[PDB]
Each structure stands twice: as structure tokens, then as C-alpha cells.
Amino acid sequence: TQYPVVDHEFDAVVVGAGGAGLRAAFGLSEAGFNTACVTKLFPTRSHTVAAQGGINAALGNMEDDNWRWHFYDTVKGSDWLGDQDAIHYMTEQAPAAVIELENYGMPFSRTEEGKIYQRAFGGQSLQFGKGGQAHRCCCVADRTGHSLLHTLYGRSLRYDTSYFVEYFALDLLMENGECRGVIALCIEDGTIHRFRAKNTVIATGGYGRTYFSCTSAHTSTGDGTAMVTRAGLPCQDLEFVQFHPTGIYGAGCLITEGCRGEGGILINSQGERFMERYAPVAKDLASRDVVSRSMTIEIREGRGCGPEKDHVYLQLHHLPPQQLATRLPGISETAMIFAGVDVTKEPIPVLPTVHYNMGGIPTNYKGQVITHVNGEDKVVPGLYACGEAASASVHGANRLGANSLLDLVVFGRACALTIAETCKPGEPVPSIKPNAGEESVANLDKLRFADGTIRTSEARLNMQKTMQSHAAVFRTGSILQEGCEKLSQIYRDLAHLKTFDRGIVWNTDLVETLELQNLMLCALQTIYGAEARKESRGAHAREDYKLRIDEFDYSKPLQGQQKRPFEEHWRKHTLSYVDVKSGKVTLKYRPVIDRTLNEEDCSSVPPAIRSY
Amino acid sequence: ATTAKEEMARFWEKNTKSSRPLSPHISIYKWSLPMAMSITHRGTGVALSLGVSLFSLAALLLPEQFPHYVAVVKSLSLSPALIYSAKFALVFPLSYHTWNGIRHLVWDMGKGFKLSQVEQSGVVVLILTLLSSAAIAAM
Amino acid sequence: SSKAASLHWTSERAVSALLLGLLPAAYLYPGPAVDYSLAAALTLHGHWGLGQVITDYVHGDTPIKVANTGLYVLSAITFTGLCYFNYYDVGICKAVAMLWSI
Amino acid sequence: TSRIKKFSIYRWDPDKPGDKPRMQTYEVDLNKCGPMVLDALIKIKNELDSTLTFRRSCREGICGSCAMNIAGGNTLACTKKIDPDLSKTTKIYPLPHMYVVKDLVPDLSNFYAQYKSIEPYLKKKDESKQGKEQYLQSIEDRQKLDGLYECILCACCSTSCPSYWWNGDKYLGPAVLMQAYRWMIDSRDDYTEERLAQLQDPFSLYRCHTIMNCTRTCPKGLNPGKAIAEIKKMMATYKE
Ligand SMILES: *Cc1cc2c(cc1C)nc1c(=O)[nH]c(=O)nc-1n2C[C@H](O)[C@H](O)[C@H](O)COP(=O)(O)OP(=O)(O)OC[C@H]1O[C@@H](n2cnc3c(N)ncnc32)[C@H](O)[C@@H]1O
Ligand SMILES: CCCCCCCCCCCO[C@@H]1O[C@H](CO)[C@@H](O[C@H]2O[C@H](CO)[C@@H](O)[C@H](O)[C@H]2O)[C@H](O)[C@H]1O
Ligand SMILES: CC(C)Oc1cccc(NC(=O)c2ccccc2C(F)(F)F)c1
Ligand SMILES: O=C([O-])CC(=O)C(=O)O
Ligand code: SF4
Ligand code: F3S
Ligand code: FES
Ligand SMILES: [K+]
Ligand SMILES: [Mn+2]
């Protein structure tokens, strides 16, 4: 091709520089591995920077805690689609992960003992669901992700990690089922780069921008998810999309769940704190899937607020202004800028907003990416994934608030740890065929010079409005099917794309056309997996299949129950595949892992009724 | 795996030899009174210095001494308006720079850094400068 | 010292303060003592101040050394002439009074 | 039924040989646009000119990506209200006195290298004990970091400082200096004196002549001028 291809050789290459990628990247250098971090954004612009409410750790700073209580909250929160071995690892590691962050310099808020301040957060209890509200969300006021990312970035400057900032990863370099590295575009100068490495770590974030309204950054476009799909690998549980209860109305910006953790309440057009009726015990601190469904029924039934009766109010003003200024200063500023609301006098208009992707690239608990052949998992040699892009799956069907930033640092560090115990630095870099990756250049060059009927921004909008109405909080079979048809037609319509910018240096016309390819691969698997999952679990609610369907009826004594066969129940992960030429999705399924790392230390939690 | 010094030197190597433009600045940036007052503190500072050094050079080089050149000017029987305007023009930079100098020495204590206080002390400097100049040029 | 830069910043402020105090001293107790103290402070303050202007605006090792060497010459000649004026002529305070009686 | 607002935006293309900077005017119906200038730039890119190039990501003023010069002042395009006075054309420029990569995208890597240079990370003498326990820090000592840690490194303040315009090669600028102070007064940090020592030269800190443009321009409401003045007070008083 007419593109000068620059070859690099590293021990490891990390794609992404959010919480996950930063912690994996310098963890590897710390372990003595010559590491490259490839990121399309400067590291502190990553969506992690926008995170507010905090990061969970059973530190016991506000009361006596126990990481196995956090374990149980997360398992019950996941609605038993979560892998309990990964969840065991994530909640046991949490105190040491958050202590690591503080010792790095993270300016956590403080208690009167001088320790890390922790707040209540949604769906977290003491004594395995029986002992009341837990306070283990460690926070830097309501700017926790901002401070976590700047702390992690500042820490990474002490190691010899080679950074390749504003490089856009295009595809993995696969040979014989193993990953040999990544091929990427240097945005600053237009050149193509192949990064050969023994191990690759994918920490590329979520894909909330498949929807019309999200809290997510413009850059949350599922790029590492799509590279996996294009490599012929499965993605997992992509139909499980988290609607955060409180995105600010209109702009969509996140108003943290810490507002409810500190005392904020939701009220409708009648002033009722309606969560007292939907969730008698947890009220406004129920799980997000439950609070989002609640808010949604109040609106469509007919008790929405505002001149259009299409949102609800997040009331903070009954709380002391000094608490609001110490605990919630960030959203106080954002509510004024993006809604003109002064939080000490008037409520914040909020509605369920696409926020987070439970699904991702399937991994084991060590960070290694897996495929699934003939009923057994098979690690993909050389390929790892952590953070929102990954499906460990610590979150299953519904993530607990403040578990993601934890996930970021626990499994970012796990990838570093696992490579450290598995490989040595300096091992021979694997050869790539001389033309490895040239189909990514050919695709990029066809998009650079595309000149059809449907400009990129027009097709992106057709995708976002199609996901927004056909794959929302509540779903039915007929609506999901028509969204599958609309998406598949949009995906073929990509043959009609038109770009205008024929340059190669900082051509965001072309890069955003690449993100649209990425976004659509994510969107197809999301909505087709949704249409096929004929049950209600976590954030996936079918009104034509309102029940959770597990291998037993766990709402009854199990003695004398005929166990449902794997193919006749839904307590299993969705695995999704895309033939990238056609756009055709194929679905397979793999079992949920119910065992922990140590039954004597941490009991496996069997399915149960799930109420807040 | 580059140090900050290497990154800095690579930046200048790369950019000073490139075809890249320097984006505009003085021609496009919007004015404020603090900014205009910072420029004026520099300009009156330099003007006072250069005037102090001219006086010193005239002391070393003029054929006659000071009271002659004063008597010369008194003989010209100049108008009070022209005397007043000249005096004002002479004391005004000294006055401006002294008060704004005081405002700077406050800043060096860490006081007055809220932006609305930067505006208040600026205007306070303007009115003390105007009052002291008009009064001294009437002495 | 290896604290040269902050000792300089502190001296700048010390000398500026001195010169402030000389202005009432010149109006109140004019004479030889204030004349020569004004000669010293006026020259020191102006010299340091013009060196900040040069540091800001002049770049390159040779223009920097040229600018600064000329500044020493300007300052040295300035202090010399002000002392000359104070010894052989009427001095600073008296000169201002005479000017202001025009 | 419409309110047409005019934007005049700085344009340059490195892939055009001999391209000289120009300004291009776009008309935008404010009734079909969000309230912020970034919303206008995204609308223009999607609907009128997909060649218009700029950095953006978070659209809520927290990532720092979209710093540019709007209506004469450095701000975040995503939190800068569109000026609805239709008689006025809004002029949009890159951050001032920077090498322009393309259109509204400046090369920020010297800025990034100056931040790296002050070692923006907690340092302790005995670091053998890190990873074991949380360091203690009082509520009072944590309060000292308020107004310093919120910085988003957008470079709005530094690229508004005339000192950084003439000596950005050697003067760290208000952003990086306020972060040096953020670590100097972190009560957990043990290198306060080494961090001051590093600023003992004519340029790194002492090109600051208190112009106060940094504080006027900061979109987070922070005060780097005040922070630079507390650094200066510490420089003159500490003992080796
Ligand atoms: C949207 C959001 C999420 C959020 C939150 C607030 C908001 C507004 N608050 C949270 C909180 O208080 N507590 C918590 O546990 N989670 C919270 N979240 C969710 C959470 O922040 C995210 O799930 C998480 O931060 C994601 O982190 P991760 O490291 O996995 O990914 P990222 O920060 O999105 O960064 C992605 C990086 O990957 C690089 N990238 C992306 N595409 C490419 C390509 N094509 N090539 C190269 N690199 C790529 C990006 O540059 C970026 O650095
Ligand atoms: C010796 C004489 C030296 C001083 C005289 C020079 C006169 C020229 C000054 C030019 C000042 O120009 C003017 O400054 C003011 C006040 O800071 C600016 O005002 C700006 O800041 C203030 C608050 O700080 C806001 O109230 C206002 O809405 C804003 O636009 C205004 O946009 C600018 O147009
Ligand atoms: C856009 C305009 C109003 O803005 C400008 C333009 C040119 C110079 C300046 N102001 C200085 O040049 C100045 C003034 C006083 C003290 C120190 C300086 C210094 F250090 F050099 F930056 C401001
Ligand atoms: O997603 C999370 O973990 C929590 C979040 O956005 C919030 O602060 O409400
Ligand atoms: S200080 Fe204010 S303006 Fe300067 S970089 Fe940080 S946030 Fe951006
Ligand atoms: S504008 Fe510049 S000169 Fe100092 S006070 Fe701010 S860094
Ligand atoms: S786009 Fe993140 S600050 Fe404007
Ligand atoms: K995920
Ligand atoms: Mn067709």
C-alpha cells in the first residue's frame, strides 16, 4: 500500500489508557516487561476521568465490613449471570487495590480518623444482605474517576512504558488462534504502525455511543470490542446495557448515584418518593436496573415531570448545603451549567440514560481472553482484556455502582500479574507474515475516499435512534425484531457511505467513520442477542418473557425438581459472532461459573429471588 | 520511554522544522483591565528608568548646571495650563507605577488573588493615580 | 548560593519597598542622605527591572549577553551620573523642588 | 422560525501543500442546535463540513479535550454558551501561540512534557511500605488540596499567559506550576524541598509576573496565579 508501515516490537502492548489500561501498562513495566501503551486519546481525556461517585472497597473505615459481604452484593447484583470466581477475586482484592491508589497519591476525602471516606451506594449491604446499608464506596468527593485517572497517569510517568498517544488501533494481528499484536494509525502524522508483541491487553472502554442518549464520552465507541469481532472471536453478554438511573435531562450528563448515597431522593410529579413503593427496603438505593425500570414506568404511565412529563426529579435541597458542597461539588456545577438548577433550592431533572456496558470480551478471572469450543473455555494465547471492554464477568446482568473503577484497577493489575507469572520479558517476539494487517489498511483507505449516498453522521444517527427505541429499558419480541432488521439494513447501507476529508493527518472524518464500523458491530450483537434472550435478567427486561429462567425454579424447594437442560434455560452467557462482510450475527452460549476461588474462604452463592 | 527533557527537545526539533503555523495570539486575544494595567506597569517602569538615565547623562554631559535650565524655563513665562499639563505628564507615570507597585507587593504576600479583587484593586489604583497626579501637578 | 533565584526575587521586593519608603523621606527630610539613597535604589531597582524585561523578550545566548552587558553600562553610568549630580550640583530632592517651583 | 448564528473558524490543512491559514464562516440555526459551542462545532462537522477538525470527548467540561479560543478567550467549547446575539459572528481560534497540527488542534506535547518534569506523583522517603496501609491524612490537610487537584490539564490558563507565549520553552506555565504546588502541600509527600529546589532558575517559575490571565480564563474556576504566589512565598522561606 501507499502507506509507510512502521514495525515495532515489544514484550507487551496495551491498547487503552483509561483506568484499566494505565494500571496494566505500568504494572507490566514494573514487572520488567518492555511495554507499549497505544491509545487514541491522551490518557487523561479517557472516559474514566468522568467518573464521580467512587470505588468500592471493604476497608471498614465507616463501620465493620467484610469483603465477602461485597462479594455477595456483587453476585446478587449480577443476578447470577456473574462469574463468582472473578467476583471473588475482584472483591477480595478491593482493599489492597484502593490502598494502592491512596498510596499513589489519590486525594481521597477523609474521615475524622484521617482514613478514606466511604459513602453508601446502590445495592450494597452488611451481613450478606441482612444487616443494613453498607458504606464502602471510597470517593474523592464526587470526582473520584477524575482523580483516579490523574493519579494513575502521574504514577505511570515513573516507568519506561513507551506511550503511543493518539494512535488508533485498527485490528489485532492473529496467527493460528494467537494474538501477535495490533496494527494502528498514527493520527498525528498519518502513518500505519504494526506493534508486534508476545502479549496484547485490550482496555478500550465501552460503547454507549451506539445509543442516542448516553452519559458516555463521544470516544466510547467499542473499538477493542470490534477488533475482537473482526478477528473471529466471540463477545459476551453484549445485550446487557446498563441504564444509569440519573442522566441529566437533555444533555445526558451523569448525575452521580452518590447524590442518593448522601441522602438525595427521587420524586415524581406528585412529589411522592416513589422508590419507597418499588423497593420498600433499599428505596432510592436499590439496584440500577430496578431504579431505572421504576423511573421508566412512572413516566410512561403518566407521572413524569417537566412541561412534557418525560423525566423525574432528583431532589437534593433538603440536605445541608455544606454536605452538598463537600460531598457533591461536581454535579452542583454540572447541574447549573447543563440545566440551570441550583441544587440547594430546586431538584435536578433526570432520566435513565445508557451509561455502561456489562457485556464485553469474555475473559477468565486472570484477565486472559477466552473462546468457547465444544463446551469448554480455551484461553486465547497472547490476548488479554480488562475494564469496561472486558466481560470477566464480575458484573453479569447488572453492575453495582462503584464496582467499575475497582474492576479497572483489579483486572488491569491482574493482566500484568498473569503475564508476569506466565512469560518472561525479552522472550522472542513472534513473527508476523510480511503483509499481516493489510486488510485493515485497505479498509481504512476505502473509508478515506468513500463517496456514496449516506454520510457518516447520518448513518451513526440512524443507528443511535434505532437502538434507542428498539433496545431500551423495556423490550418486547416484535420491537427487538424490527430493530434487528433496521440495524442489518443500516449495516449493509455502510456500502453507501460518503466522507468528505481526503487528508490523512488528523482526519477525524475518517476516524469517526472507523468508530462507526466499530459501533455497528457492537450494536448488531447487542440487539440480536437481546431478541434471542427470551427471559428477564438484570438490565435485560422482556415484557413478553417477564420471568428469570434458570436451570431450576429457585423460587421453590429444589428437592424433587427436574433440572432444566442447558438449552432450555437462560442462566448462561451469550456469546456473539459476526461475519463482518455480511453483518450476520451468530449466537452460542457458555455456562456461568458459580464456583469461587476457595469454597472454605468464600461460599458460592446459589441463585435466589432478587429483591431490594 | 523518553524523559521530559527529551520530549521537550523532540518537540522543538519537530515543530521548528515543520510547515506548521503558530496560531494567533496578541491579534486575537480579548482585552481586560488587569491585562492593560500589567502592560502599563511595564511601560511606566521602563519609561521611569529611561528618564532617570537621561537625567543622569545630562548631568554628566550638558555644558551648564541645573539652576540655569530652570531659570531658562522660568524666563519663558509659560502658561499655567502648559506648566500644569507638563507636571501632570511627568508625575503620572511615577504615580501609576508607584500605586500599582504597591498592589504588586500585596500580591507578593498572596493577598488579592480572587479575580474580582484583581478588578477592585486595579480600579483603586486608577483613582489613586488620578488623584495624586492632579494634586501634585497643582503644587 | 543554589538559592540564587529566590534570593534575587526577595531582594527585588526588598529594594522596591526601600524605594517606596524613600519617597516620603524625600518630601519630608530632603538632603544628602536621601539623595544618595535615591541614587542607589533608583539604579538598583531599575537595573533588576530592566533585566526582567530582557529575560522575557530577548532570546539566544549572544543577544542575551549583549542586551545584559549594555544594561550594566547603562546602569553603571546612571548611578555615576546621579552621584555626580548629588555631589557637584544641587542633588535629587532639591532639583525636584526647583523644577516644581517653575 | 429560525435564528441563524454565524461562526468564523480558523482553518489549516497540513495535507494541502502550500495551504495557508484562513477563516471559514459557517451559518448555524440555533433552534436546531444545542446551547454550547461544541454543539455547534459538532453540528457543523456532521452537517456542513466533516473536514472541520478539533479535539473533543466528554462534552461536560471534565476531560479538557476541547480547549480552544472562543470570542477572544480560552475556554472549553463544551461548557461555553453559544452567544445568541445574531448580529455578532463568533470567532473560534486554536489555543494561542501554539503550533497548529490541523485546524483547531494544537500540539500539546511540550505542555505534557513540562507536567511530567515536575514529577506529578506522590513521593515518600521510605516507600518500601507502600501497598500495605492507607496513609493517614486529616480532613484539614485534605482541604488544602481543594482548588488544586480539580485541574483538568486543558492548557487554557498556560496558553493565555503572555509569559508562556514568549518563554514557553523554559517557563512551566500556570497549569504545571499549580500542580507542582498541589504536590508541595500534599501532607503525604516527603519531597517538598526537592520540589522547590527544582524551580531555582530564572525561568521555570520566575517568568510569572502576576498578569492574572490564567485565573481569568480557567474553566474550572481555579486560581493558578494564587498558587504560583504561594510557591513564591515558599521559595523565599524554606531551609536546605
Ligand atoms: C460514563 C461514566 C462512567 C462511570 C462514571 C461516570 C460516567 C460519566 N462513574 C463511575 C464511578 O463513579 N464509579 C465506577 O465504578 N464507574 C463509573 N463509571 C463507569 C466507569 O468509569 C467506566 O466503566 C470505566 O472508567 C472505563 O474505564 P476503562 O479503562 O475500561 O476505559 P475508558 O476510561 O473508557 O478508556 C478507554 C481507553 O481506550 C482507548 N481506546 C479506545 N479506542 C481505541 C482505539 N481504537 N485505539 C486505541 N486506543 C483506544 C482510549 O484512548 C481510552 O484511553
Ligand atoms: C494608565 C492607564 C492604563 C489603563 C487604561 C487602559 C484602558 C484599556 C483597558 C481595556 C479593558 O477592556 C475591558 O476590561 C474589562 C474589565 O476587566 C473586561 O470585562 C470583563 O471582565 C469583567 C470581570 O473581570 C466582567 O464584568 C465583564 O463582563 C468581562 O467582559 C472587558 O471585556 C474589556 O473590554
Ligand atoms: C493581547 C494583549 C492585550 O496582551 C499582551 C500582548 C503583548 C504583551 C503582553 N504583556 C507582556 O509582555 C508583559 C507585561 C507586563 C509584565 C510582563 C509581561 C511579559 F512577561 F512579557 F509577558 C500582553
Ligand atoms: O457507574 C458507576 O459505578 C457509578 C456512577 O456512575 C455514579 O457515580 O453514579
Ligand atoms: S488550571 Fe484551570 S485552565 Fe489551567 S489547565 Fe487546569 S483547569 Fe485547565
Ligand atoms: S497569567 Fe501568566 S504571568 Fe503569572 S499570574 Fe498567570 S502565570
Ligand atoms: S470535551 Fe471534555 S472538556 Fe470539552
Ligand atoms: K463490561
Ligand atoms: Mn443499497
Automatic annotation (TrEMBL), chain B:
<keyword id="KW-1133">Transmembrane helix</keyword>
<keyword id="KW-0408">Iron</keyword>
<dbReference type="InterPro" id="IPR018495">
    <property type="entry name" value="Succ_DH_cyt_bsu_CS"/>
</dbReference>
<protein>
    <recommendedName>
        <fullName>Succinate dehydrogenase cytochrome b560 subunit, mitochondrial</fullName>
    </recommendedName>
</protein>
<keyword id="KW-0479">Metal-binding</keyword>
<comment type="pathway">
    <text>Carbohydrate metabolism; tricarboxylic acid cycle.</text>
</comment>
<feature type="transmembrane region" description="Helical">
    <location>
        <begin position="82"/>
        <end position="99"/>
    </location>
</feature>
<feature type="transmembrane region" description="Helical">
    <location>
        <begin position="43"/>
        <end position="62"/>
    </location>
</feature>
<feature type="transmembrane region" description="Helical">
    <location>
        <begin position="120"/>
        <end position="138"/>
    </location>
</feature>
<comment type="function">
    <text>Membrane-anchoring subunit of succinate dehydrogenase (SDH) that is involved in complex II of the mitochondrial electron transport chain and is responsible for transferring electrons from succinate to ubiquinone (coenzyme Q). SDH also oxidizes malate to the non-canonical enol form of oxaloacetate, enol-oxaloacetate. Enol-oxaloacetate, which is a potent inhibitor of the succinate dehydrogenase activity, is further isomerized into keto-oxaloacetate.</text>
</comment>
<dbReference type="InterPro" id="IPR000701">
    <property type="entry name" value="SuccDH_FuR_B_TM-su"/>
</dbReference>
<keyword id="KW-0812">Transmembrane</keyword>
<dbReference type="GO" id="GO:0046872">
    <property type="term" value="F:metal ion binding"/>
</dbReference>
<feature type="binding site">
    <location>
        <position position="42"/>
    </location>
    <ligand>
        <name>heme b</name>
    </ligand>
</feature>
<dbReference type="GO" id="GO:0006099">
    <property type="term" value="P:tricarboxylic acid cycle"/>
</dbReference>
<feature type="binding site" description="axial binding residue">
    <location>
        <position position="97"/>
    </location>
    <ligand>
        <name>heme</name>
    </ligand>
</feature>
<dbReference type="InterPro" id="IPR014314">
    <property type="entry name" value="Succ_DH_cytb556"/>
</dbReference>
<feature type="binding site">
    <location>
        <position position="97"/>
    </location>
    <ligand>
        <name>heme b</name>
    </ligand>
</feature>
<dbReference type="GO" id="GO:0009055">
    <property type="term" value="F:electron transfer activity"/>
</dbReference>
<feature type="modified residue" description="N6-methyllysine">
    <location>
        <position position="14"/>
    </location>
</feature>
<dbReference type="InterPro" id="IPR034804">
    <property type="entry name" value="SQR/QFR_C/D"/>
</dbReference>
<dbReference type="Pfam" id="PF01127">
    <property type="entry name" value="Sdh_cyt"/>
</dbReference>
<comment type="subunit">
    <text>Component of complex II composed of four subunits: the flavoprotein (FP) SDHA, iron-sulfur protein (IP) SDHB, and a cytochrome b560 composed of SDHC and SDHD.</text>
</comment>
<keyword id="KW-0349">Heme</keyword>
<keyword id="KW-0472">Membrane</keyword>
<dbReference type="GO" id="GO:0016020">
    <property type="term" value="C:membrane"/>
</dbReference>
